[PDB]
Amino acid sequence: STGSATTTPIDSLDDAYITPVQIGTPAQTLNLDFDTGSSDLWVFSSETTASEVDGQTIYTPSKSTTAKLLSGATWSISYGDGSSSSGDVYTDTVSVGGLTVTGQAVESAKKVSSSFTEDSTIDGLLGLAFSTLNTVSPTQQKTFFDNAKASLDSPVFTADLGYHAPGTYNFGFIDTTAYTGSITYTAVSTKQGFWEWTSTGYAVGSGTFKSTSIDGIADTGTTLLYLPATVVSAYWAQVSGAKSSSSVGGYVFPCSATLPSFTFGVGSARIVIPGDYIDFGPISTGSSSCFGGIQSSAGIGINIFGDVALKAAFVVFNGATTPTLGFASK
């Protein structure tokens, strides 16, 4: 089997992407944030504290003839941005772009933190990291990809995120029309539960490539590109007036600037992030200070190849017995 679904930016900055997902019988369609950095499929629901729902579409398990309470199971998750959610668990039929999994754990939110409530466009998350990170207790649950894998024509999914435009998540096949040149594959460590890999270096603009190993994660659920402070300083030093602002929470730059590109290495290959992809607009409405799309990872503990990086590429998440990542230009 295969599936193919369009993913759409939630706003004019590409802060996140939503993909429609069919849950239950008859189908209830929710727009989920596909997140290769976590491993829980959770939704706003009829059980979510009413004051914490503000415009989201909810899953109502009592209206699904295929929903079953997963008795005793609870979940609770905290994300790198400080947001969180928790609740109980149902199993139900879940379909993405024509690919159907029966018996998928659908984690129903009883509580969500304010940033989720405040984002009316995201009805939940669909985790695509390794199932060892799933938070369901006392019986850990599998991701949608892990449950679908055996049925797929090939044990892969691909992320093709657009810049200010829709893109595609495919399951079970590699669309050879969706990229240019060849796909370069690189080793993955699953030891932390992430799609963790080592970039071979970077360049800023038209500058020379610096060969240096940068371990990080491919994370579709993180907006920006978080890299070591040395690398980020070298980038922003090329932008007149750019500075790190403790009050704003990262590097800012004059909105009048033209940003240089940023290149990252994948083995001997190179992925070029155009300068425009690194512009996240005014820090507050009407400001002439703009927020940078490349930020230091020094306070995180891990480097994160988020959407800023991934949307410059066609990305293969290869879930073979030894997982690997593939990157192609597009």
Contact by Cβ (8 Å): 154, 305: no
**End-to-end CA separation in angstroms for the chain:** 25
Asked if residue 33 lies in contact with residue 122, where contact means CB atoms within 8 angstroms, the answer is yes
| Contact call for residues 169 and 34 (beta carbons, < 8 A) | yes
The yes-or-no answer on residue 35 being catalytic is yes
Q: Where in the chain is the domain with CATH 2.40.70.10?
A: 5-174, 175-330
Task: Go through 207-225 and write b for each residue having 16 or more CB atoms within 10 A of its CB, e for each that does not.
Answer: eeebeeebebbbbbbbbbb
**Resolution in angstrom units:** 1.1
> How do strand 28-35 and strand 41-43 relate by DSSP bridges?
unpaired
Q: Tell me the β-bridge partners of 30.
A: 21
Instruction: Classify domain 5-174 by CATH architecture.
Output: Beta Barrel (2.40)
Question: How many angstroms separate the CA atoms of 31 and 6, rounded?
Answer: 11
Catalytic residue among 38, 64, 199, 296: 199
**Which whole-number Å values give the CA distances from 140 to 70, 134, 182, 224, in the listed order?**
11, 6, 37, 29
Q: Which residues neighbour 6 within 8 Å (Cβ) at sequence distance 6 or greater?
A: 19, 20, 166, 167, 168
Question: Would you say 227 and 303 are in contact if contact means Cβ atoms under 8 Å apart?
Answer: yes
How far, in Å, CA of 270 to CA of 184, rounded?
Answer: 9
| Known catalytic residue at 15 | no
Distance CA 145, CA 309 (A): 22
Place of tokens 């499929």: 41
Catalytic residue among 33, 35, 160, 307: 35
Q: Which CATH superfamily is domain 175-330 in?
A: Acid Proteases (2.40.70.10)
189: which residues sit within 8 A by CB, 6+ positions away? 196, 197
